[PDB]
Amino acid sequence: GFKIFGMPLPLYAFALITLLLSHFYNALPTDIVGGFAIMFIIGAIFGEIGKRLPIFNKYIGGAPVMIFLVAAYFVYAGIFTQKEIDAISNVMDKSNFLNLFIAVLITGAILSVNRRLLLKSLLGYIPTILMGIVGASIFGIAIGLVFGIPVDRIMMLYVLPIMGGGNGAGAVPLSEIYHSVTGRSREEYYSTAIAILTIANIFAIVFAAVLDIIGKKHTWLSGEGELVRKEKTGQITHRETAVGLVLSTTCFLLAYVVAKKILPSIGGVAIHYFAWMVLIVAALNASGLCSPEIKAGAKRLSDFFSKQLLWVLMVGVGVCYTDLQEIINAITFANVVIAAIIVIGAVLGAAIGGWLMGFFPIESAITAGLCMANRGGSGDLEVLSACNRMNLISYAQISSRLGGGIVLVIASIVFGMM
Amino acid sequence: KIFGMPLPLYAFALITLLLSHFYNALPTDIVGGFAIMFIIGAIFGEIGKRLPIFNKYIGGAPVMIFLVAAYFVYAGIFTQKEIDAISNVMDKSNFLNLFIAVLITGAILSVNRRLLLKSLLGYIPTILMGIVGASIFGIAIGLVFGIPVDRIMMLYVLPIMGGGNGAGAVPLSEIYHSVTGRSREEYYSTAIAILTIANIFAIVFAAVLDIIGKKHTEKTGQITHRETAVGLVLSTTCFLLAYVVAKKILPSIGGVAIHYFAWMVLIVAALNASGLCSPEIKAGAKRLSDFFSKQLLWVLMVGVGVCYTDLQEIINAITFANVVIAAIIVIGAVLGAAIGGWLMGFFPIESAITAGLCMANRGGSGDLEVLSACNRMNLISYAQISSRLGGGIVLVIASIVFGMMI
Ligand SMILES: CCCCCCCCO[C@@H]1O[C@H](CO)[C@@H](O)[C@H](O)[C@H]1O
Ligand code: NA
Ligand code: NA
């Protein structure tokens, strides 16, 4: 009766048996039901394992990472069946659980805070991001020349893609800007960019847990899950929580309709729909259209995802947004080192910047540093789960989305300069 | 407030819906889907909830959304994209099964180990007796109207005895499509219509049996999200096992093919009796089922009205023939459960209400409608055994019936 996943070993065995029956008989619906079934079980076991591996389990960050890495190794080693990969992929992409997840988090995180606090951060945050970029560039250029690599490459094939807001946000559009300005094939760029950015993404998740340990070892640096130094609710029901779900989706829809047809770009920046959402939700908070009861509902919902479904999510993240074969194709000692150091440049860059802006250095280096250099949205979840600061999702998204859009403007200029 | 959202807030959402609508910008995925489904379901849910005649016997809040939604597809009110988004949630993502899976699990695990085991020996047989009587009378009156027996079982008997909209119409269409291959909407539209007619007769005879009756005289506390989350694990994992069983291990017990949902009922029921789940977890599954049945039910109907309903066919099968056939099947259940219960040691009137009318009624909403018509509201617990477990039994029987026919 020693529990796995709040399920006693006997009960878990029943499920683990079922998983294996589906696995060996090759019978599985490639849908939500089939997906969650597998994801829950697989996540559960490796979650616990990673939670209790001695060296491997350090801080809180051991459990989310295990599932993620393990799951990727299952795809790479072909342990998953094609139908299983399809089922998981169907939940993450075709059904689009990923966005929902982030949407729920953002909504719940923003609707919990006071209206007075809101605008106070945003003004000091963006500069911190730029500080992180400077540091990411300064260190990149520095290490580039150590390896005898021209600076242009460092900015175009190393720095910019890493800091860029992920696969869809950076690799996809940075190859577009590359082709528009150079004329050389997108694949030539993308293939190198996507590969290297994923390497850095793995370092980002590692250093996230390292900064966690350094934060709890040197309390002066850490805010213990809070970036800024600095109505009570009645009883809650399912309906309030359910309303949280309505608001989570409907806010994403509005943001989507805005970024597609109404206000696709404010200026030189194209605003990614998630960025709009943050502004919409924040606006919705200040408008106070949501009563405290409902505002809690959104929080409560966010908890259910971030604490129950987080393990599930990682199984999906390790499958879809981590091609271990493309990494291998660019694991020359050189890239591994260059990439890692650029991340460290972002860490120190955002640490110093935030410290100057009034935020806690550890949190600043995570939100404005590692969350830039990670693989955008999928990455943010991977990083924030490694340092147990999942409540900063909203900030992480500002860097990955708005900060990613900034990378594009900078990129265009860099490309033009050559 | 609309759907627990104050009118100002709901407006914000309703505005957004219309922006997505007019601008034709909508992700054809879960997020986009639920966004629309929540909002649309919310308004028409309230509308159908406020309507006087319609709420009490027409099914009300759910029926509004499911009919309205169908009219939106038929009248082309929805955009291709919007239909795609909703369909993407219901089929490609397969929310429908998850929904049913969660319900089944929560409904079966909520029955106490003793209640379940004890109920099987006496109450459960009475239910089966009611079904026999419901079938025998149905078949009998079918031929009187020159109706083939297969129709009597598939389009009349089974759907009536099946517990409700979510529990019978929704999954019986699923089993119908999985075994015949014909559209769900063809079945659903006829089934949902007939079953509601019978539901109205059930509430009438409940008051008639009341007059005839008077004329002829371990419960745990600390449930957390994890427990509820475990409910979700068990809901899916139990469906997976059932799926693996139907597809390779035991696709058919004999010449008859057991549909995976039927297996699930047996698996979950087994899991209950095995007591592998502690009361805390067993509640978690219940709580989950509540969240779906009470929050996401409105959403579900928006989806059901889009994919699972054709208006012409459904409008057409409103024939006086149905009125009579349906009523008599109910009477067959009454006499079936009356005789059975009398043989089992229960009072015939009470047996015919709980194991008879509560089967033929519209699942849970129905039980409340029936038990309030005969003042026997204290038998809610029994009524729900019929609507939930007995409904799950109807599914196993239904698979066998379908297989035998084809
Ligand atoms: C104008 C800027 C609007 C977006 C602000 C996003 C930050 C709100 O985010 C919230 O802030 C809290 C206070 O730091 C944290 O405790 C919460 O975990 C975090 O989610
Ligand atoms: Na990045
Ligand atoms: Na019924």
Author numbering:
A (entry chain A): 20 to 249, 258 to 445
B (entry chain D): 22 to 238, 258 to 446
Reproduce the article's own wording on this structure.
The 2-HCT family of transporters generally translocate molecules with a 2-hydroxycarboxylate motif (HO-CR1R2-COO−), such as citrate, malate and lactate across the plasma membrane, and activity is tightly coupled to energy provided by a sodium or proton gradient as a form of secondary active transport. Our crystal structures reveal that the KpCitS protomer is formed by homologous N-terminal and C-terminal halves with inverted topology, each containing six transmembrane helices (TM 2–5, 7 and TM 8–11, 13) and one helical hairpin (TM 6a/b (or HP1) and TM 12a/b (or HP2)). Our results show that the KpCitS has a homodimeric structure in which its dimerization domain remains fixed during the transport cycle due to a hydrogen bond network as well as extensive hydrophobic interactions, while the substrate-loaded transport domain undergoes an elevator-type translocation (i.e. up and down) across the membrane.
In contrast, the other crystal form (form 2), refined to 3.8 Å resolution, contains two pairs of KpCitS dimers in an asymmetric unit; one has an outward-facing conformation, and the other an asymmetric conformation. For the sake of the accuracy, we selected the structure of the highest resolution dataset from each of the three major conformational states for analysis; thus, the outward-facing, inward-facing, and asymmetric conformations of crystal forms 2, 3, and 4, respectively, are shown throughout this article. In the outward-facing state, the hairpin loops are located close to the membrane/periplasm interface, which appears to favor the entry of external substrate and ions (left). In the outward-facing state the bound citrate is partially exposed to the periplasmic space. However, it is unlikely that it can escape backwards because it is secured by strong hydrogen and electrostatic interactions. In the outward-facing conformation, L408 and I121 are in close proximity, and serve as a latch governing access of substrate to the cytoplasm. In addition, M417 seems to act as a plug preventing substrate exit.
